Design a protein around this motif. Structure first.
Motif, PDB file in Angstrom:
ATOM      1  N   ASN A   1       0.789  -1.214   0.000  1.00 37.30           N
ATOM      2  CA  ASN A   1       0.000   0.000   0.000  1.00 37.30           C
ATOM      3  C   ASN A   1       0.839   1.290   0.000  1.00 37.30           C
ATOM      4  N   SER A   2       0.555   2.181  -0.949  1.00 37.77           N
ATOM      5  CA  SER A   2       1.314   3.438  -1.127  1.00 37.77           C
ATOM      6  C   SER A   2       1.306   4.408   0.032  1.00 37.77           C
ATOM      7  N   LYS A   3       0.194   4.470   0.744  1.00 38.69           N
ATOM      8  CA  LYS A   3       0.118   5.312   1.919  1.00 38.69           C
ATOM      9  C   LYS A   3       0.844   4.644   3.081  1.00 38.69           C
ATOM     10  N   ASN A   4       1.588   3.588   2.781  1.00 33.39           N
ATOM     11  CA  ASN A   4       2.419   2.989   3.818  1.00 33.39           C
ATOM     12  C   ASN A   4       3.916   3.050   3.568  1.00 33.39           C
TER      13      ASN A   4
END
Lengths: 175, 176, 177
Positions: free
Chosen positions: A151-154
């Motif tokens: 996940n990119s927001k991670n």
């Protein structure tokens, strides 16, 4: 002599990677490529270098299935702990009975790591005194889902590399 | 000139794999029968441990055993000796070596009935002067343990043809 | 042809392994002083490096660098001693900038323990202490750490048997392992 140079290379690698406090921090670089190799069936799993509970204690290591294994096959990163044959196994207590903690590190600074811990089951054959090179692995086939991990927001993966940590509780160990 | 290179490597690897830095050495001796045979035949009188250390930059040390005994225990005991070696930082170290030392043969039975001899390093001994060559004269127990006790079929100092020796240096009043 | 590079690669790897320390403490034995200073003076080999050391097994990678014939402010007159943050394997997990107190030393071999010691707090604005970009950040330390005069005299015992010892010590305060 290519086998000699590889034998050397590996020995060097182990020496460069050994730790002696039951603590392993395992840098995994080239994530995308390695997961690709997993998915293609080229290289199902990866190993850490051996680490130890003490200079003369248990020899250990970690193993990951980037594209998942069994219960998490294809959907999670599978993280397993591994008792190896140690040079001093005869002097050690068996079965292995220490608490173990498995981690994927949050690189964001929020220190929001993913942690699973457990007490080593004496009846498990993962923890008998090893017979060959290493006992059967034991851990979390569904340690963390590709979804959460990637996940990119991670920030579990940064610059195509992640860090796994194993920590063995040394309570009541002799040395 | 490359078998000597490969052996030089092998040994260096061996030392790195064997080094400890807390004045504590645990020395696994495998192939007992054969090695004692080599002792008896005069083929290989004595064996050495890999070097260990009091601290990363402290004294370099090691142990030496005569499986078929030496001097006072020749032919009847396992002789266990302590050895000060030349260290990279000897100039910064205190001389003579003055630490208490403990020598051990480990009971593998679990009853932890080990054989232990301890002593204070004698300042007048030349075993403990700052080393001049590769290593000072060895010092310890020629009669550490008798073949009889060691090999006793009802004992567990030898298990699967291997025994474990332990040296422990007291670090009291030492800096790193 | 290529295998001399292989044997040298090995030799160096071996050297690092033999030299590594993991408590933020480095003791650096410098042998063959006269010859090495000669090489400095002749412009043959301006500076020498220690082997990498570490604050902890998985902490900052570091090392020391000396200019035997001095550098900049102490060029030609002093031994210049510099501290160096190197690129570490776990730099992503470490706090930046590097912010630890550092102490630099030349050891008195006489037993009087009359060492030469300079200490300082790492300046956060200094680029010596940013998270490294290449092999190692710009060095930082004392170009005029100790004068050839003090270092080299007989009554002094900073050099004994043509060898001296330098010590770097990093304060680990507030550094989780």
């Amino acid at each position: 002599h290519k086998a000699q140079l590889n034998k050397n290379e590996e020995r060097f690698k182990q020496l460069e990677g050994a730790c002696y406090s039951g603590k392993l921090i395992w840098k995994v670089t080239d994530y995308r490529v390695k997961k690709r190799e997993a998915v293609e069936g080229h290289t199902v799993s990866v190993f850490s270098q051996p680490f130890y509970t003490s200079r003369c204690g248990y020899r250990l290591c970690a193993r990951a299935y980037l594209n998942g294994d069994g219960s998490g096959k294809g959907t999670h990163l599978s993280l397993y702990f591994v008792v190896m044959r140690g040079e001093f196994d005869s002097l050690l207590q068996w079965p292995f009975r220490q608490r173990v903690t498995l981690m994927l590190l949050d690189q964001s600074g929020k220190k929001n790591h993913i942690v699973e811990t457990f007490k080593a089951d004496p009846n498990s054959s993962s923890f008998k005194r090893p017979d060959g090179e290493m006992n059967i692995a034991s851990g979390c086939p569904r340690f963390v889902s590709h979804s959460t991990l990637e996940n990119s927001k991670n920030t579990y993966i940064k610059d195509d590399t992640l860090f796994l940590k194993v920590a063995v509780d040394l309570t009541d160990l002799e040395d």
